[PDB]
Design an enzyme around this catalytic site. Structure first.
Site, PDB file in Angstrom:
ATOM      1  N   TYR A  66       0.832  -1.202   0.000  1.00  0.00           N
ATOM      2  CA  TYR A  66       0.000   0.000   0.000  1.00  0.00           C
ATOM      3  C   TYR A  66       0.874   1.262   0.000  1.00  0.00           C
ATOM      4  O   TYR A  66       0.594   2.205  -0.746  1.00  0.00           O
ATOM      5  CB  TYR A  66      -0.912  -0.012   1.237  1.00  0.00           C
ATOM      6  CG  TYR A  66      -1.842   1.175   1.320  1.00  0.00           C
ATOM      7  CD1 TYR A  66      -3.059   1.176   0.650  1.00  0.00           C
ATOM      8  CD2 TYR A  66      -1.524   2.283   2.101  1.00  0.00           C
ATOM      9  CE1 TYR A  66      -3.924   2.262   0.723  1.00  0.00           C
ATOM     10  CE2 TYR A  66      -2.379   3.381   2.177  1.00  0.00           C
ATOM     11  CZ  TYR A  66      -3.581   3.363   1.487  1.00  0.00           C
ATOM     12  OH  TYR A  66      -4.446   4.422   1.559  1.00  0.00           O
ATOM     13  N   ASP A 123       1.292  -2.292  19.249  1.00  0.00           N
ATOM     14  CA  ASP A 123       1.349  -0.839  19.428  1.00  0.00           C
ATOM     15  C   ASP A 123       1.716  -0.125  18.115  1.00  0.00           C
ATOM     16  O   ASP A 123       1.646   1.106  18.052  1.00  0.00           O
ATOM     17  CB  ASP A 123       2.347  -0.480  20.539  1.00  0.00           C
TER      18      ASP A 123
END
Ligand code: NAP
Ligand code: NAP
Ligand code: GDP
Ligand code: GDP
Lengths: 319, 300
Positions: free
Chosen positions: B126, B260
């Site tokens: 992407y 995270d």
């Protein structure tokens, strides 16, 4: 009876300088038993068109693919059309790699270029530095198009475990090259320029300063290496197929080999108005030398003489 | 006395899409299309939309968010930029992301560093697909003198966002999670440690900036549309704004088991501040309250 399936090697852009090189080496004894070598061109199928590409791959069902086809050109061609060089090659590389994949090809070996390397960089440039900065502004469209082959190769592997790889050759030269005095590369372009100058009795005009350093690779040597990569090199990361960093030569040194080989004793001038491109592209064959440490390359000056000899022997048929 | 314009907004049914709709609402016809209008991965469907709606200006917001992410977006960005070009569009403003920036880098990240190293391995397909928009923009300009540009926004939040508790972003997800927790009387579960830092941009602010880029920013190089590097907030700080906006006084827990992600993506709006030095952004906590307000007002 027990029977083992043959290997079907589809060579996209097999009519080219590298394509015809692989043809010669395979015929001269590189092809293994069972192996069917299929060399195609644009006449066979226009690889920018998805329908034409998918048809060639469904007809010739390949187990192995050597992707050599591309919108190629020398420094004075690729710097003029960066949108076309980007679009056409991305379209082509997408169509070939996807059609190979969906036809269940086990291995795909594509052909990259030393222009993919970043402009501002350290020397010698290894295979890890391919994405460590932007390429040269002149031919960035063609450079980024070839860079994205590696992105696709890594993407196919992480999603499907595909053994799709690539190779990074230096400046290729040899028989069946594009000897056009405007569309060709440095060495084929000069081989035509000296031929015309020796015939017309004119002086030689070398574009640029004549100082940019280049590593040259004979087409027949690259062919030998290309065949080995397909049969043994199972890394997704590309491999630099190049002569040693110590075997680098200047444009003036290359132009001198072409003058020597064609026995030209006329004037040699440098047109500094024309662009010199990149000064250095110095590649490291350290990875290649860990695989093939005893592989011997054709001496530059001997290979130049043979390319000059072929061009004189075959001119009416040459490009 | 004002020249006619036909602004085609690809992906006008998204968060940024609906933001530009609201802000726009003289002689300029605004056309907002969705996937129902045309499938931008299909070349025939894209060329048809551009031949029907003949745009003078294009705002390319549509995108698919590793092989599929790469292929579909390259196909989409190729179809839109080429169809715009061959329909004679004067300007094309596409939307990039902070995920295009290299993984191993210096901070703050400016517009020059977009190609100075590989992006994060997680969503590289992407990231590279959005990077190649800039390569195309520079390619169209060198070959045809095209004024095709791009913008790099930071973490976008606001009305008409994807509030899915699994597919959404931090703030939309935390907005839905607090809504359910305040209703059910349950505790809040925030993914990760709570310490990763982010720059947030209100959708209505980005829309205001997007409109200006189309009308004044004539650089081929992209522009980072972001709040200051000093205005970077932690996820615990963001989660606190959501809790304060929805008046939630329940338990707040952090699920360390969850990833995270990238700790910092710190962008530099130095280029934006040289163009619009007196542009004032919506205060984060006020913008969070308004996003929380809209979500309660419009939930069904
Ligand atoms: N030559 C160098 O110095 C050098 C250096 C580094 C890398 N390379 C790599 O070398 C490869 C090409 O070999 P080459 O340099 O010998 O070039 P080449 O002689 O010009 O041949 C290129 C081949 O690509 C085919 N091709 C081009 N456009 C096509 C299309 N639309 N559809 C189908 N086939 C198409 C050509 O077929 P037709 O003749 O039928 O059109 C031809 O067989 C490229 O991958 C290039 O990156 C070359
Ligand atoms: N949101 C953020 O936090 C954030 C952060 C950084 C960068 N950005 C960038 O901002 C851009 C826009 O994001 P967004 O917030 O508007 O996301 P979004 O809400 O998911 O909107 C995506 C839009 O693209 C359209 N679309 C998707 N696939 C399509 C296809 N195949 N054909 C046609 N249209 C298609 C959608 O229409 P349908 O609804 O009809 O399917 C929709 O309008 C993205 O390119 C993204 O990289 C956003
Ligand atoms: N293509 C080409 N290049 C030439 C010629 N004469 C000198 N050069 C030099 O050769 C280099 C370009 O050669 P090429 O194979 O296209 O590429 P490069 O490695 O990308 O620079 C530049 O440094 C030019 O200055 C010529 O007649 N044709
Ligand atoms: N999407 C999402 N992220 C959350 C949530 N709770 C905490 N986070 C954290 O918020 C951070 C940023 O998330 P997000 O807006 O999705 O995106 P990013 O900028 O793409 O990493 C990450 O470190 C997440 O772990 C939640 O419920 N949804």
């Amino acid at each position: 009876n027990l029977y083992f399936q043959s290997m079907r090697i589809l060579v996209t852009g097999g009519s080219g300088l590298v394509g015809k090189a692989i043809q010669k080496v395979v015929a001269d004894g590189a092809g293994l038993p069972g192996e069917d070598w299929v060399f195609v061109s644009s006449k066979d199928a226009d690889l920018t068109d998805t329908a034409q590409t998918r048809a060639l791959f469904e007809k010739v069902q390949p187990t192995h693919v050597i992707h050599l086809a591309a919108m190629v050109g020398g420094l004075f061609r690729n710097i003029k059309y960066n949108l076309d060089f980007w679009r056409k090659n991305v379209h082509m590389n997408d169509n070939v790699l996807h059609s190979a994949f969906e036809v269940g090809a086990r291995k795909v070996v594509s052909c990259l270029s030393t222009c993919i390397f970043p402009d501002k960089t350290t020397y010698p440039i290894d295979e890890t530095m391919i994405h460590n900065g932007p390429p040269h502004n002149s031919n960035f469209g063609y450079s980024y198009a070839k860079r994205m082959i590696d992105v696709q190769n890594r993407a196919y592997f992480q999603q499907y475990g595909c053994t799709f790889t690539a190779v990074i050759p230096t400046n290729v030269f040899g028989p069946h090259d594009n000897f056009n005095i405007e569309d060709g590369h440095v060495l084929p372009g000069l081989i035509h320029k000296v031929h015309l100058a020796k015939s017309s009795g004119s002086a030689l005009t070398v574009w640029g300063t004549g100082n940019p350093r280049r590593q040259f690779i004979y087409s027949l040597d690259l062919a030998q290496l290309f065949i080995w990569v397909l049969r043994e090199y199972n890394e997704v990361e590309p491999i630099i197929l190049s002569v040693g960093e110590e075997d680098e030569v200047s444009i003036k040194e290359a132009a001198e080999a072409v003058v020597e080989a064609m026995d030209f004793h006329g004037e040699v001038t440098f047109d500094t108005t024309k662009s010199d491109g990149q000064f250095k592209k110095t590649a490291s064959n350290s990875k290649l030398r860990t695989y093939l440490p005893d592989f011997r390359f054709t001496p530059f000056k001997q290979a130049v003489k043979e390319t000059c000899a072929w061009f004189t022997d075959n001119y009416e048929q040459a490009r």
